[PDB]
C-alpha cells in the first residue's frame, strides 16, 4: 500500500479553521466505494489517461460510483477534510502486455473540457479515454476567464494545471504492469491551500489511470480487461453543519 | 611579502571595453562564422586573463594594425598586467568584477552567466514593450545607479579545477584545437541599459570591465614572456 | 533608530588597490579540490632564486661567452649589474623584478664551463662597485671584490654579487640608480692562460646564469610593460 | 634523479572525477620505453630544441617509441592520469663540447607546425631540429582559430604557449654538459587542469632537448653523438574503460 | 549541463540496451514487447550554480 | 596455451555444454551453457575444468 508523504495518512488533527465540533464520522466508514471505469483496449494510444476526481466522483457518480451515506454526509456539511485511499483493479492476464500508471494527482482540472465548463456523464462515455494532446501538455484547457468585450482576449498559450505526461511518476503512483501485479494500492493524506477546503467544490486529489504501454494481446486470447476502482476516505473531518446542498 | 601570489594578483586592472546592449542580444555564433550572420558583436566580456576573440576563448592574442573596412572587427581582450607576472601554469582564484562606465551619467546594468552556461536571447512582450530575457534570471543582474559602478565578487565556478595559464592539450579533437582550453573562465558579463527595446537609442555606449583576483593560488612554475632587444 | 553616519570625502570612489572585499553575488559555491596539483607557488621569490640563462650581444643573442685563446689584459666579458640592463631582460631575476619598483639582495651569477673535460686553468671573477670608469685591466680587477675560479672540481661557480648601496632599496628600472654611472660591473677575467688539450676543440664556451640570493626581496608592484605582446 | 615538486612523484591518489575503479596497472609496468631522437651535429644552432610530447610520443611513435601494452592500454581507457619519468642519454665523450638542456616542459604545443595542424613523422625527419625563431619565442605558432569569413582575421602577435628560451631552466631540468654527466634523470608527477585529463588528447608534459652551447668537436675525433630517451609512466590511473579508439 | 560537447570530442557517453540471447516469447502471447525506461538520479547527485531558465515552455 | 605473438589482445569464451539433442554452434547458444571468459592478458594458459554431470556414478 503506497502511503503518501507520511508513515500513516490516517493521522489527521481537526482543522484549525473552525470553532465547532467536527463531524468526525458517519454511518459506514469502514467500507469501500466501487465504481466502474472504462475498459482498456488496443486502440488506446500512449498517454491516453482517464481521470477520476475526488470528491468529484461521489457527486457526479462517475461510473456508478455510489457514495451511499458519504455523499449524503458531504452534502450536509460545508467544509470537508479527508485523506483518500484508492484501489484500482484490472484483470491483467498472462496473455496481455502493457502498463497502466495509476496515480493520485494533486490539484488538477483533468475532468474539464478543453473548451467549456465541466464534463457530463454522456461525454465521458463517448470518448472513453482522454488523449494527451497539446492542450493537456501545455495546460491550455483549464477554463479561460470571460474577460468581456472591453479587454481584447489574449492568446492563452499556457496554464499551470498541465500534465507533463513523462513526469507523472513523481506523484503517489504504482505501475499496473502486465507481469508484476494486477492491482494498485495508494493511500494519500489530506492536502490543501487551507486546513480544510469546501465540500461541493474541491479537487484536492485526482485518481489518474494513464496508459504508458499500449495494450497488446493475441487474437482469440483474453480480451479487453476492465478497470475498476475503490475510493474510501480516511479520517474525514466535516465542519459547518447545514441542510442539503441546492 | 609584496611578491606574495595572494597579494600580487589581488588588485584591480582593466580587461575589456565592451559595448552596452540596448536590445535583446544575439550571442556570437561559434567559430567559424560565415558572412551574413546577423548577430551582436563585442557586447560580451569573457572574464579570463587568457586571450579572447569575439567573446570566446582564443588560442593566440591578436590586435589590429591597419583596420580597414572589409569584415567585422573583433573585440580581442588580454590581461597585460597578468602574463608579464604569470610565471606559472595554473591559477585558481575568485574573481572580483568592477564595471566602470565610459559614458557621462550612464545608467547601465551588468548581467552574468556562469562558465559553461549561455546567454538567454529572446524577449517577452510586457505591456506592448519588448522587455528582453536578460532582465530576469537566477544569475546576478546587478543594477547601477545613474552614474554609478557595479562591483561584485564571483566564485571559481568553472568545471576545471584550475585555469591553465599555459595549456597544451586539445579540448575538442585535434587540427587547430591544440592549446585551447574550453572551461577556463569565470563566466561572461555584458552591460545593458535597463529600458525596453522601443527606447533603443542611436549612440553606441561603451563600458569598461575591471578585474581583481581574490585569493590567488598559482601552481607549476613556468616562463615569462619574451622581451625583445630593439 | 538610524545610526547617524557622516560619509567621508572619498565616498562612491572605486579605488583599484583597496585592501578590502566587496559584496558576493553568487555565493555558496563548492569549488572542486586542488589537492592533487603539486608545486604551489606561494611566493614569486621562489622563481627569482631559480637560475635562468642570461643574454649577450656577440634579435639572436647568445647565453654563453666564447673564450678566445688570445691571452689579454682586458675582461673576457664585463656586463654592468643593473636589473634594467639587457643582459637581464630574459632571466627570471630581471623579468620578475622589472615589474616591481624596488629590490634588495644579492644577484647570484652561476657559471658553467661547457668546454672539454681535460681543460685546466683559472678564472678571476671581479665585481666592482660603481666607479666613474669601468674597470678593464686585470690589475684593476684584483683590487675590487674577486674570487678565483679554477677549472678543477669546480666546473660550476656561483659568484654571489654583494649588495652595496647607499639606500635600503634600489630603483629596479633605472640606468643610473645612484652616483654617476651604472651600478657596478661583474667581469669574468681569465687569470692563467687556458690549457686546452689537442684533438679537443679550442675556443670553449662558458654558460652564464642569473639567480637571486636567499635574502633577495622586492617591493612596490607597478603596472608592467605591456610591450611583450606586440 | 631530478624529482619534480615533491619528494616522491610515485605517490598519487585515484582521481576524484570518477565513480568507477581505476585500472591502476597493466601487463608490464616496470619497464622503460626507448625511442630514437635526432642526432646532434655542429650545424645545430643555439636554442634549436627538439620536443617529445608525452603521451603524444606513444601514439605517433616519435623515433620508434613503441609503447607496447601501454599504448594499447591508453587506447582502451578514456581518462588517463600518470606521472612521467624520462631518461635522455647522449654519449658525450671527452672530445666534445656543448650542453643540452633536457627539461620536462608543462603544457606546451611545441610539436605543432607554426602554420597548420600537427606534425607528421616525415616532417620531423626533414628539419631534424626546430629552430628557435620569432614565432616560438612569441608563441605565434600555436594554432590560430578559424574565425570565418565574417570576422576580419586579426593580426595574431602573441600566444601564451611560447618558449622564452632563456628561461627554460625553471622547469624540471638537468643540463647534459660535456664534462659533468652523459645522461639526465628527470621524474615528474601528474599535473593538469582536471584531476585526470583525456588519453588521446593530452599534453600535460613535454620532453624538451634544447641545445644551449653548440656542439664542437675536432675533425677525425668522435663525431655526432646520438640522443636516446626512455619514457616510463609512474603510477597511472586509467578511468573510463571502453573499446579501442577510432 | 547544457552543452552538446561538454568534453573531449563527442557526446559524453552512450547508454545502450543490447539484447544478448534471442528472446523467447511464448505463442498466444504478443510478439514485440516494450521496455519502459526511467531516468532518476543517484544518491550522490549534486547540482550547482542556478542560472536563469529557458522561458520557452510558455509559448 | 595461446602460442601467438606477445602483443595479442582479445578474449575467448570456453563453453562446455551438457549432452543436448543438437550440438551448440551459436555464441548465443554458448553463453547459456557453462562458460568462462579467457582473456589474452596475464592468462596465456587457461585450465578449463570440464564438470562431471552424469545420471550415473560412473560412465562407460
Amino acid at each position: 500500500v503506497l502511503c503518501a508523504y507520511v508513515e500513516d495518512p490516517t493521522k489527521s488533527d481537526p482543522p484549525s479553521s473552525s470553532t465547532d465540533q467536527p463531524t468526525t464520522t458517519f454511518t459506514a466508514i469502514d467500507r469501500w466505494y466501487t465504481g466502474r471505469l472504462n475498459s482498456w483496449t488496443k486502440a488506446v494510444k500512449t498517454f491516453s489517461f482517464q481521470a477520476v476526481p475526488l470528491p468529484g466522483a461521489f457527486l457526479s457518480r462517475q461510473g456508478g460510483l455510489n457514495g451511499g451515506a458519504f455523499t449524503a454526509t458531504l452534502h450536509r456539511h460545508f467544509l470537508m477534510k479527508c485523506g483518500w485511499q484508492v484501489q484500482v483493479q484490472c484483470n491483467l492476464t498472462q496473455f496481455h502486455q502493457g502498463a497502466l500508471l495509476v496515480a493520485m494527482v494533486p490539484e488538477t482540472t483533468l475532468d474539464v473540457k478543453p473548451d467549456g465548463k465541466a464534463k457530463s456523464l454522456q461525454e465521458l462515455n463517448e470518448e472513453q479515454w482522454v488523449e494527451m494532446s497539446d492542450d493537456y501538455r501545455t495546460g491550455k484547457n483549464m477554463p479561460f476567464q470571460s474577460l468581456g468585450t472591453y479587454y481584447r482576449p489574449p492568446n492563452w498559450t499556457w496554464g499551470p494545471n498541465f500534465i507533463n505526461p513523462y513526469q507523472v511518476t513523481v506523484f503517489p503512483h504504482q505501475i499496473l504492469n502486465a507481469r508484476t501485479s494486477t492491482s494498485v494500492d495508494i493511500n494519500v493524506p489530506y492536502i490543501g491551500e487551507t486546513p480544510t477546503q469546501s465540500s461541493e467544490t474541491q479537487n484536492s486529489w485526482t485518481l489518474l489511470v494513464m496508459v504508458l504501454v499500449p495494450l497488446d494481446y493475441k487474437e482469440g486470447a483474453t480480451t479487453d480487461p476492465e478497470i475498476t476502482f475503490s475510493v474510501r476516505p480516511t479520517s474525514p473531518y466535516f465542519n459547518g453543519l447545514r441542510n442539503r446542498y441546492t | 611579502n609584496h611578491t606574495n601570489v595572494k597579494f600580487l594578483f589581488d588588485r584591480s586592472r582593466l580587461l575589456n571595453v565592451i559595448k552596452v546592449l540596448e536590445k535583446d542580444a544575439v550571442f556570437p555564433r561559434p567559430f567559424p562564422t560565415a558572412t551574413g550572420t546577423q548577430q551582436d558583436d563585442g557586447y560580451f566580456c569573457l572574464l579570463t586573463p587568457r586571450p579572447t576573440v569575439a567573446s570566446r576563448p582564443a588560442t593566440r592574442f591578436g590586435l589590429y594594425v591597419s583596420p580597414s573596412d572589409s569584415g567585422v572587427l573583433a573585440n580581442t581582450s588580454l590581461d597585460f598586467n597578468f602574463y608579464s607576472l604569470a610565471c606559472f601554469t595554473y591559477f585558481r582564484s575568485d574573481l572580483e568584477v568592477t564595471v566602470v562606465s565610459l559614458e557621462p551619467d550612464l545608467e547601465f546594468a551588468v548581467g552574468w552567466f556562469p562558465s559553461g552556461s549561455e546567454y538567454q536571447a529572446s524577449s517577452f512582450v510586457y505591456d506592448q514593450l519588448h522587455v528582453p530575457y536578460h532582465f530576469t534570471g537566477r544569475t546576478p543582474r546587478a543594477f547601477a545607479s545613474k552614474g554609478g559602478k557595479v562591483s561584485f565578487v564571483l566564485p571559481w565556478n568553472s568545471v576545471s579545477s584550475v585555469l591553465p595559464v599555459r595549456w597544451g592539450g586539445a579540448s575538442k579533437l585535434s587540427s587547430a584545437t591544440r592549446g585551447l582550453p574550453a572551461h577556463a573562465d569565470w563566466g561572461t558579463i555584458y552591460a545593458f541599459i535597463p529600458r525596453p527595446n522601443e527606447k533603443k537609442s542611436t549612440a553606441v555606449k561603451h563600458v569598461a570591465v575591471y578585474i581583481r583576483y581574490k585569493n590567488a593560488r598559482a601552481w607549476c612554475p613556468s616562463m615569462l614572456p619574451f622581451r625583445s632587444y630593439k | 533608530g538610524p545610526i547617524p553616519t557622516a560619509p567621508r570625502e572619498n565616498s562612491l570612489m572605486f579605488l583599484s588597490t583597496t585592501p578590502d572585499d566587496t559584496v558576493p553575488a553568487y555565493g555558496n559555491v563548492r569549488t572542486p579540490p586542488v589537492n592533487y596539483l603539486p608545486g604551489e607557488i606561494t611566493d614569486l621569490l621562489q622563481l627569482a632564486r631559480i637560475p635562468t640563462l642570461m643574454a649577450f650581444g656577440r634579435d639572436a643573442y647568445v647565453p654563453y661567452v666564447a673564450v678566445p685563446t688570445q691571452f689579454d689584459d682586458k675582461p673576457l666579458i664585463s656586463f654592468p649589474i643593473t636589473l634594467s640592463d639587457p643582459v637581464y631582460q630574459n632571466t627570471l631575476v630581471g623579468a620578475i623584478s622589472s615589474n616591481f619598483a624596488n629590490y634588495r639582495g644579492c644577484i647570484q651569477i652561476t657559471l658553467t664551463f661547457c668546454g672539454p673535460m681535460m681543460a685546466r686553468g683559472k678564472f678571476l671573477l671581479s665585481y666592482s662597485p660603481p666607479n666613474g670608469t669601468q674597470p678593464q685591466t686585470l690589475s684593476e680587477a684584483m683590487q675590487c671584490t674577486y674570487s678565483i675560479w679554477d677549472i678543477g672540481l669546480n666546473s660550476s661557480w656561483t659568484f654571489v654579487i654583494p649588495y652595496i648601496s647607499p639606500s635600503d632599496y634600489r630603483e629596479t628600472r633605472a640606468i643610473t640608480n645612484s652616483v654617476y654611472s651604472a651600478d657596478g660591473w661583474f667581469s669574468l677575467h681569465k687569470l692563467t692562460k687556458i690549457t686546452l688539450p689537442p684533438d679537443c676543440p679550442q675556443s670553449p664556451c662558458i654558460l652564464f646564469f642569473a639567480s637571486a640570493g636567499e635574502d633577495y626581496t622586492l617591493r612596490l608592484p607597478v603596472d608592467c610593460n605591456p610591450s611583450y605582446v606586440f
Side-chain angles (χ1 to χ4, degrees), chain C residues 36-120:
Chain C
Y36 70 99
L37 285 175
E40 180 175 359
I41 298 172
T42 306
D43 195 359
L44 295 183
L45 290 172
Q46 294 180 356
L47 276 80
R49 297 174 183 174
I50 292 172
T52 56
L53 289 164
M54 299 179 68
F56 289 101
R58 191 173 288 174
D59 197 75
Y61 285 173
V62 166
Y64 56 88
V65 173
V67 183
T69 186
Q70 183 179 3
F71 187 80
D72 199 358
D73 196 0
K74 63 175 68 175
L76 193 57
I77 196 63
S78 67
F79 55 91
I81 303 305
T82 304
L83 272 70
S84 67
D85 194 74
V87 304
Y88 289 103
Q89 285 182 354
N90 297 117
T91 65
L92 282 179
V93 176
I96 292 172
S97 297
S98 69
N99 299 323
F100 290 157
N102 294 317
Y103 71 97
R104 175 180 176 87
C106 297
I107 309 300
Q108 183 173 0
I109 304 299
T110 298
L111 310 182
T112 297
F113 187 75
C114 294
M117 189 179 288
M118 294 301 291
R120 295 289 186 269

Side-chain angles (χ1 to χ4, degrees), chain A residues 55-184:
Chain A
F58 289 93
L59 275 70
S60 66
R61 293 182 181 178
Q62 183 177 0
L65 197 276
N66 206 167
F70 175 70
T71 302
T73 307
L74 194 151
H75 287 294
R76 289 179 176 88
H77 290 87
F78 183 67
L79 305 98
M80 197 273 277
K81 185 254 186 66
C82 72
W84 296 108
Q85 181 175 0
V86 297
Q87 182 176 1
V88 171
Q89 298 92 15
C90 186
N91 50 4
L92 265 283
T93 322
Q94 292 176 355
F95 293 157
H96 300 96
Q97 69 181 359
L100 295 175
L101 193 279
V102 178
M104 287 291 285
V105 180
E107 292 290 336
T108 49
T109 62
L110 306 180
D111 57 348
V112 178
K113 314 202 261 272
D115 253 76
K117 341 238 149 270
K119 286 182 181 178
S120 65
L121 280 77
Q122 184 179 1
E123 292 177 353
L124 288 173
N125 201 2
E126 291 177 352
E127 60 182 0
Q128 294 283 319
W129 286 98
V130 184
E131 292 181 354
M132 187 66 72
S133 65
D134 188 73
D135 297 333
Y136 291 91
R137 290 191 299 270
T138 324
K140 205 187 290 183
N141 54 9
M142 58 181 290
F144 68 100
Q145 286 184 352
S146 299
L147 271 72
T149 60
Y150 180 72
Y151 294 100
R152 178 177 173 87
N155 299 323
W156 301 110
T157 58
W158 186 70
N161 291 116
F162 56 90
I163 299 172
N164 194 356
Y166 301 93
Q167 292 179 359
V168 192
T169 68
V170 70
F171 304 129
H173 76 290
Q174 286 188 356
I175 299 168
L176 199 149
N177 215 169
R179 49 92 52 80
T180 65
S181 66
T182 61
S183 68
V184 303

Side-chain angles (χ1 to χ4, degrees), chain B residues 176-214:
Chain B
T177 322
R178 290 291 302 272
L180 181 59
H183 300 286
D185 47 354
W186 285 267
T188 308
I189 65 168
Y190 56 94
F192 56 94
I193 296 169
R195 278 92 167 100
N197 302 335
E198 286 84 3
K199 301 285 102 175
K200 178 176 172 65
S201 179
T202 309
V204 183
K205 297 177 176 66
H206 296 282
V207 79
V209 174
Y210 286 166
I211 273 178
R212 182 183 289 176
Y213 302 99
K214 299 301 293 181

